[PDB]
């Protein structure tokens, strides 16, 4: 679970179910399990909110390659079903702590960022800062090339 604190470990949920159901199968310290999954009205609810965890934190982690993603292949890369993904979209999207944009006009929509509606600002940042990096290139090009030419 500590490893889960990066990349979300978008793992087959049943595998983690093994990893945390064999806690109840501990021939050692098992009171951890009973505090976690020896419970029913909350321990099984802990499994449920763990599904919540995997889906919503995967929504978090996967925010990079977006602007093109399908409702079906969403579930395919979600370790959970499509209408399961439908309810997950629904709750995370009415919660809307992030701003995505989606529509079943195609179903190929995504847990997006503002979807880049911006003017030159994008171009501005890009051109300016990149060109600046290039002047930096030059200004250390002279330096380091001279340095490697010191002995000569």
């Amino acid at each position: 679970l500590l490893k889960l604190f990066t990349t979300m470990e978008l793992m087959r949920w049943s595998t983690l179910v093994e990893d945390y159901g064999m806690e109840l199968r501990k021939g050692s310290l098992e009171s951890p399990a009973t505090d976690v999954f020896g419970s029913t009205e909350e321990g099984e609810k802990r499994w449920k909110d763990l599904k919540n965890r995997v889906v919503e934190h995967n929504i978090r982690i996967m925010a990079k390659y977006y602007t093109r993603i399908t409702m079906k292949r969403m579930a395919q890369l979600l370790d959970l079903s499509v209408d399961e993904s439908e309810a997950f979209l629904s709750n995370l999207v009415v919660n809307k702590t992030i701003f995505a944009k989606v529509d079943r006009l195609a179903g190929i929509i995504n847990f997006q960022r503002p979807k880049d509606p911006n003017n030159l600002l994008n171009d501005w940042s890009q051109k300016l800062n990149s060109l600046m990096s290039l002047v930096n290139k030059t200004t250390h090009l002279i330096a380091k090339e001279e340095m490697i030419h010191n002995l000569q």
Partner: protein, 48 residues
């Protein structure tokens, strides 16, 4: 003015340095490398 008559003054022929007194100045005071703004949007946004 009694006890105080002024003398015509001047600066030296300083090209010996005036050269390096403008060469380094112009080269730096003007975008140094000069390959920098070549600010261009946010400036004209506020401008226009």
């Amino acid at each position: 003015n009694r006890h105080y008559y002024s003398i015509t003054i001047n600066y030296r022929k300083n090209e010996l340095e005036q050269k390096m007194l403008l060469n380094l100045h112009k080269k730096s005071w003007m975008e140094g490398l000069t390959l920098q703004d070549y600010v261009v949007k946010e400036m004209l946004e506020l401008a226009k």
